[PDB]
Design a protein around this nucleic acid. Structure first.
Lengths: 136, 85, 182, 49
RNA sequence: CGCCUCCUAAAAGGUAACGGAGGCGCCCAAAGGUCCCCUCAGGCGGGACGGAAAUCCGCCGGAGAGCGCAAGGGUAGAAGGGGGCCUGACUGCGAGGCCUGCAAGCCGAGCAGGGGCGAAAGCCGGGCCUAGUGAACCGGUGGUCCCGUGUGGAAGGGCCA
Protein backbone atom coordinates (compact mmCIF):
# COMPACT_ATOMS: atom_id res chain seq x y z
CA UNK A 1 0.00 0.00 0.00
CA UNK A 2 0.97 3.64 -0.05
CA UNK A 3 -0.55 6.62 1.69
CA UNK A 4 2.84 7.64 2.97
CA UNK A 5 3.69 10.82 4.79
CA UNK A 6 0.01 11.51 5.34
CA UNK A 7 -0.83 14.59 7.28
CA UNK A 8 -3.64 13.72 9.64
CA UNK A 9 -4.87 10.77 11.74
CA UNK A 10 -8.32 9.77 10.58
CA UNK A 11 -11.27 10.35 8.19
CA UNK A 12 -14.91 9.44 8.74
CA UNK A 13 -17.53 7.40 6.93
CA UNK A 14 -20.21 7.83 4.15
CA UNK A 15 -20.06 6.75 0.46
CA UNK A 16 -22.22 7.17 -2.77
CA UNK A 17 -20.49 8.01 -6.17
CA UNK A 18 -17.47 9.90 -7.72
CA UNK A 19 -15.36 10.34 -10.84
CA UNK A 20 -13.48 7.35 -12.39
CA UNK A 21 -14.13 6.41 -16.09
CA UNK A 22 -11.72 7.01 -18.90
CA UNK A 23 -9.32 4.35 -20.08
CA UNK A 24 -5.51 4.75 -19.87
CA UNK A 25 -4.07 1.73 -21.75
CA UNK A 26 -7.09 -0.48 -22.68
CA UNK A 27 -6.69 -3.21 -20.03
CA UNK A 28 -9.32 -2.04 -17.56
CA UNK A 29 -10.74 -3.13 -14.25
CA UNK A 30 -13.58 -1.03 -13.06
CA UNK A 31 -15.29 -1.33 -9.77
CA UNK A 32 -19.01 -0.92 -9.54
CA UNK A 33 -20.63 -1.53 -6.08
CA UNK A 34 -17.95 -0.89 -3.57
CA UNK A 35 -16.62 1.59 -1.07
CA UNK A 36 -13.14 1.51 0.57
CA UNK A 37 -10.90 -1.41 -0.35
CA UNK A 38 -7.86 -2.50 1.56
CA UNK A 39 -4.72 -0.98 0.28
CA UNK A 40 -3.59 -4.55 0.86
CA UNK A 41 -6.29 -6.46 -1.07
CA UNK A 42 -5.31 -3.91 -3.54
CA UNK A 43 -1.69 -5.00 -3.62
CA UNK A 44 -3.23 -8.40 -3.84
CA UNK A 45 -4.66 -7.70 -7.20
CA UNK A 46 -1.43 -5.93 -8.06
CA UNK A 47 0.32 -9.19 -7.49
CA UNK A 48 -2.21 -11.39 -9.11
CA UNK A 49 -1.85 -9.37 -12.26
CA UNK A 50 1.88 -8.80 -12.16
CA UNK A 51 2.49 -12.48 -11.72
CA UNK A 52 0.08 -13.72 -14.31
CA UNK A 53 1.50 -11.45 -16.92
CA UNK A 54 4.53 -13.72 -17.70
CA UNK A 55 5.79 -11.68 -14.70
CA UNK A 56 7.20 -8.47 -16.28
CA UNK A 57 5.73 -5.86 -18.64
CA UNK A 58 4.16 -3.34 -16.18
CA UNK A 59 0.46 -2.76 -15.29
CA UNK A 60 -0.55 0.63 -14.09
CA UNK A 61 -2.67 1.87 -11.19
CA UNK A 62 -5.95 3.26 -10.26
CA UNK A 63 -7.10 4.22 -6.80
CA UNK A 64 -4.86 4.80 -3.72
CA UNK A 65 -4.32 3.63 -0.04
CA UNK A 66 -6.29 6.80 0.76
CA UNK A 67 -7.70 6.65 4.28
CA UNK A 68 -6.85 5.29 7.84
CA UNK A 69 -9.39 2.79 9.24
CA UNK A 70 -9.52 2.22 12.94
CA UNK A 71 -11.03 -0.60 15.04
CA UNK A 72 -9.40 1.39 17.76
CA UNK A 73 -8.85 -0.77 20.92
CA UNK A 74 -7.97 -4.39 20.22
CA UNK A 75 -11.32 -5.59 21.54
CA UNK A 76 -11.82 -3.63 24.81
CA UNK A 77 -14.98 -1.80 25.81
CA UNK A 78 -15.58 1.47 23.89
CA UNK A 79 -14.54 5.05 24.75
CA UNK A 80 -10.96 5.44 23.48
CA UNK A 81 -10.17 8.71 21.87
CA UNK A 82 -11.22 6.50 19.00
CA UNK A 83 -7.50 6.73 18.46
CA UNK A 84 -5.37 4.04 16.87
CA UNK A 85 -4.40 3.93 13.27
CA UNK A 86 -4.53 0.50 11.60
CA UNK A 87 -5.81 -0.39 8.09
CA UNK A 88 -5.21 2.00 5.09
CA UNK A 89 -7.05 1.95 1.79
CA UNK A 90 -9.14 3.05 -1.18
CA UNK A 91 -12.41 4.90 -1.31
CA UNK A 92 -13.94 4.14 -4.69
CA UNK A 93 -17.74 3.57 -4.90
CA UNK A 94 -19.47 4.11 -8.27
CA UNK A 95 -18.01 1.63 -10.73
CA UNK A 96 -14.59 3.19 -10.84
CA UNK A 97 -11.91 3.59 -13.45
CA UNK A 98 -9.37 1.10 -12.15
CA UNK A 99 -6.55 1.02 -14.80
CA UNK A 100 -4.19 -1.94 -15.46
CA UNK A 101 -1.81 -2.55 -18.36
CA UNK A 102 1.06 -5.02 -19.21
CA UNK A 103 0.79 -6.07 -22.84
CA UNK A 104 -1.21 -9.29 -22.26
CA UNK A 105 -3.01 -8.93 -25.49
CA UNK A 106 -6.08 -10.91 -24.49
CA UNK A 107 -8.53 -12.69 -22.33
CA UNK A 108 -5.17 -13.46 -20.66
CA UNK A 109 -5.32 -9.96 -19.19
CA UNK A 110 -8.89 -10.97 -18.67
CA UNK A 111 -7.99 -13.81 -16.31
CA UNK A 112 -5.50 -11.56 -14.58
CA UNK A 113 -8.32 -9.25 -13.66
CA UNK A 114 -10.78 -12.10 -13.26
CA UNK A 115 -8.98 -13.31 -10.26
CA UNK A 116 -7.47 -10.04 -9.09
CA UNK A 117 -10.87 -8.55 -8.45
CA UNK A 118 -13.15 -11.62 -8.41
CA UNK A 119 -10.99 -11.55 -5.40
CA UNK A 120 -10.78 -7.97 -4.30
CA UNK A 121 -13.95 -7.08 -2.82
CA UNK A 122 -17.10 -6.43 -4.72
CA UNK A 123 -19.59 -6.55 -7.52
CA UNK A 124 -17.54 -5.16 -10.42
CA UNK A 125 -16.91 -5.19 -14.17
CA UNK A 126 -14.11 -4.84 -16.71
CA UNK A 127 -13.36 -3.75 -20.29
CA UNK A 128 -11.33 -1.51 -22.58
CA UNK A 129 -11.56 1.91 -24.40
CA UNK A 130 -15.23 2.67 -25.47
CA UNK A 131 -15.89 6.41 -26.08
CA UNK A 132 -12.43 8.13 -25.99
CA UNK A 133 -12.44 11.56 -24.33
CA UNK A 134 -11.46 15.10 -25.36
CA UNK A 135 -9.75 17.59 -22.97
CA UNK A 136 -8.37 21.12 -23.54
CA UNK B 1 -6.36 -13.36 38.17
CA UNK B 2 -8.96 -10.69 37.02
CA UNK B 3 -9.65 -9.96 33.22
CA UNK B 4 -11.82 -6.92 33.26
CA UNK B 5 -11.18 -4.30 30.58
CA UNK B 6 -8.12 -2.03 30.61
CA UNK B 7 -7.34 1.69 31.03
CA UNK B 8 -7.58 3.82 27.94
CA UNK B 9 -8.24 7.56 28.12
CA UNK B 10 -5.95 9.23 25.55
CA UNK B 11 -7.18 12.81 25.55
CA UNK B 12 -8.55 15.49 23.25
CA UNK B 13 -9.36 18.40 25.57
CA UNK B 14 -10.51 20.77 22.90
CA UNK B 15 -12.90 23.71 23.18
CA UNK B 16 -14.01 27.04 21.58
CA UNK B 17 -16.61 29.31 23.17
CA UNK B 18 -19.72 30.02 21.19
CA UNK B 19 -19.61 33.33 19.24
CA UNK B 20 -21.45 35.93 17.19
CA UNK B 21 -20.67 38.53 14.44
CA UNK B 22 -21.78 38.49 10.79
CA UNK B 23 -24.36 39.82 8.35
CA UNK B 24 -26.77 40.95 11.08
CA UNK B 25 -29.06 43.78 9.93
CA UNK B 26 -31.87 43.30 7.39
CA UNK B 27 -32.31 45.10 4.05
CA UNK B 28 -33.92 48.46 4.20
CA UNK B 29 -35.15 48.00 7.79
CA UNK B 30 -35.08 51.19 9.87
CA UNK B 31 -31.42 51.51 10.84
CA UNK B 32 -30.41 54.09 13.43
CA UNK B 33 -26.98 55.07 14.75
CA UNK B 34 -25.96 53.11 17.82
CA UNK B 35 -27.75 50.27 16.14
CA UNK B 36 -25.11 47.75 15.12
CA UNK B 37 -25.34 45.96 11.77
CA UNK B 38 -22.71 43.53 10.60
CA UNK B 39 -19.60 42.63 12.58
CA UNK B 40 -16.67 41.25 10.73
CA UNK B 41 -13.51 39.78 12.12
CA UNK B 42 -11.87 40.72 8.87
CA UNK B 43 -12.65 43.21 6.11
CA UNK B 44 -15.48 41.78 4.02
CA UNK B 45 -16.93 45.14 4.95
CA UNK B 46 -15.93 48.69 3.89
CA UNK B 47 -17.71 51.34 6.00
CA UNK B 48 -19.24 53.41 3.30
CA UNK B 49 -21.33 56.49 4.00
CA UNK B 50 -22.53 56.78 7.57
CA UNK B 51 -21.18 53.36 8.23
CA UNK B 52 -18.90 53.44 11.18
CA UNK B 53 -16.34 50.68 11.64
CA UNK B 54 -15.79 50.35 15.41
CA UNK B 55 -12.43 49.75 17.09
CA UNK B 56 -13.08 46.11 16.27
CA UNK B 57 -14.13 45.67 12.66
CA UNK B 58 -17.72 46.11 13.75
CA UNK B 59 -20.17 47.72 11.34
CA UNK B 60 -22.14 50.21 13.38
CA UNK B 61 -24.86 52.69 12.39
CA UNK B 62 -23.31 56.18 12.20
CA UNK B 63 -26.59 57.77 11.00
CA UNK B 64 -30.34 57.50 10.86
CA UNK B 65 -30.46 55.67 7.63
CA UNK B 66 -32.55 53.15 5.85
CA UNK B 67 -30.61 49.84 5.82
CA UNK B 68 -28.29 50.43 2.92
CA UNK B 69 -26.96 47.19 1.50
CA UNK B 70 -24.17 48.30 -0.79
CA UNK B 71 -22.45 45.31 -2.15
CA UNK B 72 -20.13 47.23 -4.37
CA UNK B 73 -19.74 44.08 -6.28
CA UNK B 74 -16.02 43.39 -6.70
CA UNK B 75 -14.59 46.43 -4.87
CA UNK B 76 -15.80 44.34 -2.05
CA UNK B 77 -18.73 44.58 0.29
CA UNK B 78 -19.62 48.19 1.02
CA UNK B 79 -22.05 49.11 3.68
CA UNK B 80 -24.13 52.25 3.61
CA UNK B 81 -26.74 54.15 5.63
CA UNK B 82 -29.38 56.11 3.57
CA UNK B 83 -30.44 59.69 4.58
CA UNK B 84 -33.55 58.79 6.59
CA UNK B 85 -36.52 60.32 4.71
CA UNK C 1 43.05 65.16 -10.23
CA UNK C 2 40.43 67.59 -11.53
CA UNK C 3 42.80 66.77 -14.44
CA UNK C 4 41.44 63.34 -15.05
CA UNK C 5 38.04 64.97 -14.23
CA UNK C 6 38.04 67.01 -17.45
CA UNK C 7 39.46 63.77 -18.89
CA UNK C 8 36.46 61.36 -18.39
CA UNK C 9 34.37 64.35 -19.28
CA UNK C 10 35.90 64.28 -22.77
CA UNK C 11 36.58 60.53 -23.19
CA UNK C 12 32.90 60.00 -22.99
CA UNK C 13 31.46 63.20 -24.36
CA UNK C 14 33.13 62.52 -27.69
CA UNK C 15 33.34 58.78 -27.77
CA UNK C 16 29.59 58.94 -27.28
CA UNK C 17 28.46 60.60 -30.45
CA UNK C 18 31.39 58.69 -31.97
CA UNK C 19 30.15 55.15 -31.89
CA UNK C 20 26.75 56.69 -31.19
CA UNK C 21 26.04 57.14 -34.84
CA UNK C 22 28.89 54.88 -35.94
CA UNK C 23 26.32 52.10 -35.43
CA UNK C 24 23.22 53.46 -33.75
CA UNK C 25 21.17 55.67 -36.08
CA UNK C 26 18.39 55.79 -33.47
CA UNK C 27 18.59 59.41 -32.26
CA UNK C 28 21.91 59.68 -30.30
CA UNK C 29 20.08 58.30 -27.24
CA UNK C 30 21.42 56.29 -24.36
CA UNK C 31 22.44 54.09 -27.25
CA UNK C 32 24.49 53.32 -25.06
CA UNK C 33 25.40 55.65 -22.19
CA UNK C 34 26.05 55.19 -18.48
CA UNK C 35 24.39 56.77 -15.39
CA UNK C 36 24.98 56.82 -11.60
CA UNK C 37 27.10 54.28 -9.84
CA UNK C 38 26.60 52.39 -6.65
CA UNK C 39 29.51 50.61 -5.09
CA UNK C 40 29.33 47.73 -2.53
CA UNK C 41 31.97 45.90 -0.50
CA UNK C 42 32.76 42.85 1.73
CA UNK C 43 29.85 42.86 4.20
CA UNK C 44 30.09 43.70 7.85
CA UNK C 45 30.52 40.12 8.97
CA UNK C 46 33.98 40.76 7.59
CA UNK C 47 33.93 42.62 10.95
CA UNK C 48 36.02 43.12 14.10
CA UNK C 49 33.51 45.86 14.77
CA UNK C 50 35.47 48.90 16.00
CA UNK C 51 38.70 47.93 14.13
CA UNK C 52 38.08 46.81 10.51
CA UNK C 53 34.69 48.57 10.66
CA UNK C 54 36.48 51.92 11.15
CA UNK C 55 38.90 50.77 8.34
CA UNK C 56 35.90 50.19 6.05
CA UNK C 57 35.41 53.79 7.09
CA UNK C 58 38.77 55.17 6.04
CA UNK C 59 38.34 53.36 2.70
CA UNK C 60 34.72 54.04 1.70
CA UNK C 61 35.83 57.54 2.64
CA UNK C 62 38.95 58.58 0.69
CA UNK C 63 37.51 56.49 -2.09
CA UNK C 64 34.26 58.34 -2.74
CA UNK C 65 32.74 60.06 0.28
CA UNK C 66 31.37 57.86 3.18
CA UNK C 67 33.42 56.01 5.94
CA UNK C 68 32.35 53.05 8.36
CA UNK C 69 31.52 52.97 12.12
CA UNK C 70 31.28 50.04 14.59
CA UNK C 71 28.56 47.30 13.91
CA UNK C 72 29.31 44.45 11.51
CA UNK C 73 27.86 41.18 12.65
CA UNK C 74 24.23 41.29 13.90
CA UNK C 75 21.72 38.46 13.52
CA UNK C 76 25.11 36.98 12.71
CA UNK C 77 26.37 34.87 9.85
CA UNK C 78 26.20 32.58 12.81
CA UNK C 79 26.07 28.86 11.99
CA UNK C 80 24.87 28.39 8.43
CA UNK C 81 21.10 29.17 8.36
CA UNK C 82 21.44 31.44 11.42
CA UNK C 83 20.65 35.06 10.61
CA UNK C 84 18.11 37.73 11.56
CA UNK C 85 17.72 41.42 10.46
CA UNK C 86 20.51 42.80 8.14
CA UNK C 87 22.26 45.82 9.92
CA UNK C 88 25.28 45.69 7.65
CA UNK C 89 24.36 47.76 4.59
CA UNK C 90 27.76 49.39 3.81
CA UNK C 91 27.72 50.91 0.26
CA UNK C 92 27.91 54.24 -1.71
CA UNK C 93 25.00 55.08 -4.03
CA UNK C 94 26.59 58.32 -5.16
CA UNK C 95 24.73 59.33 -8.44
CA UNK C 96 26.53 61.27 -11.26
CA UNK C 97 29.57 63.37 -12.07
CA UNK C 98 31.59 62.42 -8.96
CA UNK C 99 30.86 58.99 -10.43
CA UNK C 100 32.45 60.01 -13.71
CA UNK C 101 35.75 61.42 -12.49
CA UNK C 102 35.44 58.00 -10.95
CA UNK C 103 34.89 55.93 -14.15
CA UNK C 104 38.08 57.86 -14.76
CA UNK C 105 40.35 57.59 -11.75
CA UNK C 106 39.04 54.12 -11.08
CA UNK C 107 38.88 52.18 -14.36
CA UNK C 108 41.19 54.18 -16.54
CA UNK C 109 43.73 55.27 -13.90
CA UNK C 110 43.84 52.37 -11.39
CA UNK C 111 42.64 49.40 -13.50
CA UNK C 112 45.93 47.54 -13.79
CA UNK C 113 47.67 48.21 -10.50
CA UNK C 114 48.86 45.36 -8.18
CA UNK C 115 49.55 41.61 -8.36
CA UNK C 116 49.19 40.43 -11.98
CA UNK C 117 46.33 42.96 -12.24
CA UNK C 118 45.70 42.03 -15.90
CA UNK C 119 42.07 41.67 -16.71
CA UNK C 120 41.06 38.96 -19.11
CA UNK C 121 37.40 38.70 -17.89
CA UNK C 122 34.61 37.19 -20.07
CA UNK C 123 31.18 38.89 -20.46
CA UNK C 124 32.01 41.65 -17.93
CA UNK C 125 28.55 42.89 -17.22
CA UNK C 126 26.31 40.93 -19.55
CA UNK C 127 23.47 40.98 -17.03
CA UNK C 128 21.69 43.49 -19.33
CA UNK C 129 24.65 45.77 -20.04
CA UNK C 130 24.78 47.81 -16.80
CA UNK C 131 28.01 46.84 -14.99
CA UNK C 132 29.76 43.69 -13.61
CA UNK C 133 33.30 43.53 -12.34
CA UNK C 134 34.26 44.45 -8.84
CA UNK C 135 37.81 43.24 -8.43
CA UNK C 136 38.84 41.12 -5.45
CA UNK C 137 41.61 43.41 -4.11
CA UNK C 138 41.54 47.18 -3.40
CA UNK C 139 43.30 49.77 -5.63
CA UNK C 140 45.95 49.17 -2.90
CA UNK C 141 47.02 52.83 -2.56
CA UNK C 142 44.11 54.49 -4.41
CA UNK C 143 45.37 56.53 -1.48
CA UNK C 144 46.40 55.30 2.00
CA UNK C 145 49.28 53.11 3.16
CA UNK C 146 49.31 50.70 6.10
CA UNK C 147 46.19 51.81 7.89
CA UNK C 148 45.27 48.19 8.56
CA UNK C 149 47.27 45.00 7.79
CA UNK C 150 44.46 43.05 5.98
CA UNK C 151 42.39 46.19 5.96
CA UNK C 152 40.16 45.56 2.98
CA UNK C 153 39.88 43.62 -0.29
CA UNK C 154 36.44 42.30 -1.06
CA UNK C 155 35.72 45.23 -3.41
CA UNK C 156 32.88 45.38 -5.95
CA UNK C 157 30.97 48.25 -7.59
CA UNK C 158 28.16 48.59 -10.17
CA UNK C 159 26.97 51.19 -12.75
CA UNK C 160 23.37 52.02 -13.69
CA UNK C 161 23.61 52.02 -17.41
CA UNK C 162 21.35 52.20 -20.39
CA UNK C 163 23.80 50.42 -22.63
CA UNK C 164 20.77 48.16 -23.08
CA UNK C 165 21.71 44.86 -24.72
CA UNK C 166 25.31 43.69 -24.33
CA UNK C 167 27.07 43.95 -27.70
CA UNK C 168 25.93 47.60 -27.33
CA UNK C 169 26.94 48.15 -23.72
CA UNK C 170 30.16 46.51 -24.97
CA UNK C 171 30.73 49.23 -27.49
CA UNK C 172 30.09 51.51 -24.47
CA UNK C 173 32.53 50.78 -21.67
CA UNK C 174 34.66 48.72 -24.07
CA UNK C 175 36.11 51.74 -25.76
CA UNK C 176 35.06 54.11 -22.93
CA UNK C 177 36.98 52.36 -20.07
CA UNK C 178 38.64 49.23 -21.52
CA UNK C 179 37.15 45.74 -22.19
CA UNK C 180 39.26 43.12 -20.37
CA UNK C 181 40.28 40.50 -22.96
CA UNK C 182 38.24 37.67 -24.58
CA UNK D 1 6.51 40.03 40.47
CA UNK D 2 7.86 39.31 37.02
CA UNK D 3 9.53 42.16 35.11
CA UNK D 4 5.93 43.21 35.33
CA UNK D 5 5.17 45.22 38.45
CA UNK D 6 2.37 47.74 38.85
CA UNK D 7 2.86 51.49 39.42
CA UNK D 8 0.62 54.46 38.85
CA UNK D 9 0.65 58.19 38.26
CA UNK D 10 0.17 61.02 40.79
CA UNK D 11 0.67 64.71 39.87
CA UNK D 12 2.48 67.64 41.55
CA UNK D 13 0.67 67.07 44.92
CA UNK D 14 -2.50 68.27 43.27
CA UNK D 15 -4.10 64.85 42.48
CA UNK D 16 -3.18 61.20 41.36
CA UNK D 17 -4.50 59.25 38.35
CA UNK D 18 -3.57 55.45 38.28
CA UNK D 19 -3.00 52.75 35.48
CA UNK D 20 -0.45 49.83 36.13
CA UNK D 21 2.45 49.75 33.67
CA UNK D 22 5.47 47.23 33.93
CA UNK D 23 9.26 47.07 34.91
CA UNK D 24 11.30 45.59 32.06
CA UNK D 25 13.40 47.73 29.65
CA UNK D 26 14.04 51.29 30.95
CA UNK D 27 12.96 50.17 34.51
CA UNK D 28 12.60 53.15 36.90
CA UNK D 29 12.66 56.05 34.39
CA UNK D 30 9.16 57.26 35.29
CA UNK D 31 8.19 60.91 34.58
CA UNK D 32 5.58 60.51 31.74
CA UNK D 33 2.68 63.14 31.51
CA UNK D 34 -1.14 62.40 31.91
CA UNK D 35 -3.34 65.30 33.26
CA UNK D 36 -5.16 65.27 36.65
CA UNK D 37 -8.48 66.76 37.48
CA UNK D 38 -6.31 69.45 38.90
CA UNK D 39 -7.03 72.75 37.28
CA UNK D 40 -8.08 72.01 33.68
CA UNK D 41 -5.81 69.14 32.58
CA UNK D 42 -2.32 70.13 33.93
CA UNK D 43 1.01 68.19 33.64
CA UNK D 44 0.48 65.74 36.42
CA UNK D 45 3.80 64.06 36.11
CA UNK D 46 3.15 60.37 36.80
CA UNK D 47 5.88 58.55 38.72
CA UNK D 48 4.30 57.57 42.13
CA UNK D 49 5.16 54.00 43.31
C1' C E 1 -12.58 20.14 34.74
C1' G E 2 -11.30 28.90 32.69
C1' C E 3 -10.41 31.29 27.89
C1' C E 4 -8.94 32.05 22.19
C1' U E 5 -8.72 29.59 17.34
C1' C E 6 -10.14 25.46 13.28
C1' C E 7 -13.45 20.86 12.09
C1' U E 8 -18.27 18.33 13.13
C1' A E 9 -23.04 23.57 13.72
C1' A E 10 -25.40 19.69 8.06
C1' A E 11 -24.65 26.17 4.67
C1' A E 12 -28.79 31.99 9.42
C1' G E 13 -27.35 31.57 14.02
C1' G E 14 -26.51 28.06 16.97
C1' U E 15 -25.59 22.28 19.71
C1' A E 16 -23.15 17.20 22.66
C1' A E 17 -19.44 13.04 22.42
C1' C E 18 -13.91 9.73 27.16
C1' G E 19 -15.29 13.43 19.10
C1' G E 20 -10.83 15.52 16.38
C1' A E 21 -6.75 19.31 16.55
C1' G E 22 -3.91 23.17 19.05
C1' G E 23 -2.49 27.53 21.65
C1' C E 24 -2.84 31.27 26.78
C1' G E 25 -3.41 32.52 32.78
C1' C E 26 2.86 37.09 28.75
C1' C E 27 3.13 42.02 27.74
C1' C E 28 4.76 45.83 24.11
C1' A E 29 7.83 51.92 28.59
C1' A E 30 7.24 52.43 23.71
C1' A E 31 4.74 47.49 18.39
C1' G E 32 0.51 53.49 22.83
C1' G E 33 -0.59 59.35 18.94
C1' U E 34 -0.44 61.51 14.33
C1' C E 35 2.36 63.92 10.24
C1' C E 36 5.92 62.72 6.09
C1' C E 37 8.37 58.93 3.28
C1' C E 38 8.72 53.78 1.81
C1' U E 39 6.58 49.18 -0.25
C1' C E 40 7.19 41.51 0.16
C1' A E 41 9.14 36.38 -0.14
C1' G E 42 10.49 34.11 -3.71
C1' G E 43 12.24 33.08 -9.63
C1' C E 44 15.99 34.43 -12.90
C1' G E 45 20.92 36.88 -14.80
C1' G E 46 25.34 39.32 -13.27
C1' G E 47 28.80 40.16 -9.54
C1' A E 48 34.26 41.78 -3.30
C1' C E 49 35.74 39.00 1.94
C1' G E 50 31.02 35.14 -1.52
C1' G E 51 30.89 31.40 -2.48
C1' A E 52 23.30 25.85 -0.99
C1' A E 53 21.74 31.19 2.14
C1' A E 54 24.63 37.46 3.11
C1' U E 55 25.90 42.70 0.28
C1' C E 56 25.21 45.22 -4.45
C1' C E 57 23.62 45.73 -9.83
C1' G E 58 20.29 44.14 -13.54
C1' C E 59 15.10 42.24 -14.84
C1' C E 60 10.44 39.05 -13.07
C1' G E 61 5.64 38.71 -9.28
C1' G E 62 -4.11 37.99 -6.91
C1' A E 63 1.12 40.17 -2.56
C1' G E 64 1.91 32.70 -1.48
C1' A E 65 6.64 36.83 2.43
C1' G E 66 4.08 40.40 6.79
C1' C E 67 1.58 41.75 11.56
C1' G E 68 5.52 39.36 19.90
C1' C E 69 2.78 35.31 20.83
C1' A E 70 -1.87 29.48 18.26
C1' A E 71 -5.39 29.07 15.02
C1' G E 72 -8.67 31.67 12.09
C1' G E 73 -10.45 36.17 9.92
C1' G E 74 -8.33 40.00 7.66
C1' U E 75 -5.66 42.23 5.17
C1' A E 76 0.59 45.80 1.54
C1' G E 77 -6.75 50.56 -1.94
C1' A E 78 -0.39 47.80 4.03
C1' A E 79 -3.21 46.87 9.96
C1' G E 80 3.11 46.02 6.83
C1' G E 81 8.87 48.59 6.38
C1' G E 82 11.58 53.87 7.81
C1' G E 83 11.97 59.15 9.80
C1' G E 84 9.77 63.66 12.88
C1' C E 85 7.38 65.57 16.48
C1' C E 86 3.70 63.59 21.18
C1' U E 87 0.63 61.67 25.03
C1' G E 88 -6.39 60.80 25.07
C1' A E 89 -2.96 53.53 27.17
C1' C E 90 -7.55 61.61 28.91
C1' U E 91 -11.84 62.71 33.38
C1' G E 92 -17.13 63.86 32.74
C1' C E 93 -19.95 60.78 29.45
C1' G E 94 -22.62 58.71 26.33
C1' A E 95 -27.53 58.02 22.35
C1' G E 96 -28.21 53.81 20.52
C1' G E 97 -27.12 48.33 19.15
C1' C E 98 -23.93 42.92 19.41
C1' C E 99 -24.94 38.48 22.01
C1' U E 100 -27.41 36.85 27.32
C1' G E 101 -32.92 34.49 30.94
C1' C E 102 -29.28 35.82 35.66
C1' A E 103 -24.60 38.65 35.90
C1' A E 104 -21.73 39.17 32.53
C1' G E 105 -18.67 40.51 28.56
C1' C E 106 -18.81 43.53 24.04
C1' C E 107 -19.63 47.85 19.71
C1' G E 108 -19.97 53.37 19.75
C1' A E 109 -21.34 58.51 16.62
C1' G E 110 -21.73 62.68 19.09
C1' C E 111 -21.83 67.18 23.56
C1' A E 112 -18.21 69.21 27.62
C1' G E 113 -13.50 70.33 29.99
C1' G E 114 -8.19 69.21 27.90
C1' G E 115 -4.80 68.76 25.50
C1' G E 116 -1.28 66.52 20.54
C1' C E 117 0.09 65.05 14.93
C1' G E 118 -0.81 68.93 10.07
C1' A E 119 -1.31 74.86 8.04
C1' A E 120 -5.09 72.55 7.78
C1' A E 121 -9.96 68.74 5.26
C1' G E 122 -9.42 65.64 10.50
C1' C E 123 -7.18 61.04 13.54
C1' C E 124 -6.11 60.18 19.17
C1' G E 125 -10.60 58.50 25.12
C1' G E 126 -3.65 52.15 23.78
C1' G E 127 -2.08 48.59 20.54
C1' C E 128 -4.47 45.26 13.67
C1' C E 129 -8.28 42.66 15.53
C1' U E 130 -10.91 37.24 18.27
C1' A E 131 -7.57 34.33 24.53
C1' G E 132 -3.06 37.50 28.95
C1' U E 133 -9.31 36.60 33.32
C1' G E 134 -12.14 36.17 38.79
C1' A E 135 -18.24 38.08 42.36
C1' A E 136 -18.91 38.76 47.39
C1' C E 137 -17.03 39.26 51.85
C1' C E 138 -12.63 40.74 54.58
C1' G E 139 -8.81 44.06 55.24
C1' G E 140 -4.50 48.13 53.08
C1' U E 141 -2.94 52.43 51.12
C1' G E 142 -3.20 57.72 48.27
C1' G E 143 -7.90 60.80 49.26
C1' U E 144 -11.87 63.08 50.67
C1' C E 145 -12.83 66.53 54.28
C1' C E 146 -19.57 63.41 54.37
C1' C E 147 -20.67 60.98 59.44
C1' G E 148 -19.67 60.97 64.73
C1' U E 149 -24.11 57.85 68.80
C1' G E 150 -25.04 65.39 74.62
C1' U E 151 -20.86 69.42 72.25
C1' G E 152 -15.88 70.55 70.78
C1' G E 153 -12.42 67.03 68.55
C1' A E 154 -11.35 61.52 68.04
C1' A E 155 -10.91 56.07 68.06
C1' G E 156 -13.66 54.94 64.67
C1' G E 157 -15.93 55.48 60.55
C1' G E 158 -19.67 56.91 54.64
C1' C E 159 -18.12 57.72 48.95
C1' C E 160 -13.51 58.30 45.43
C1' A E 161 -8.93 56.30 43.43
Amino acid sequence: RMKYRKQQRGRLKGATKGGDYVAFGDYGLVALEPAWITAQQIEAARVAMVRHFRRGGKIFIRIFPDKPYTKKPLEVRMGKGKGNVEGYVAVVKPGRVMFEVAGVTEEQAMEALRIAGHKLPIKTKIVRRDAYDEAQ
Amino acid sequence: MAHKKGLGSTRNGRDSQAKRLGVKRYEGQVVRAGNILVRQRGTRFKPGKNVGMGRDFTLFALVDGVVEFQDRGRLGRYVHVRPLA
Amino acid sequence: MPLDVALKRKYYEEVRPELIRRFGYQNVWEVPRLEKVVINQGLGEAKEDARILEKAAQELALITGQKPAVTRAKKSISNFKLRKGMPIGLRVTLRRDRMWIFLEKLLNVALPRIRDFRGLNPNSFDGRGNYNLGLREQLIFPEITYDMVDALRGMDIAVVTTAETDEEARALLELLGFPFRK
Amino acid sequence: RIKLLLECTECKRRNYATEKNKRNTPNKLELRKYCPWCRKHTVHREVKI
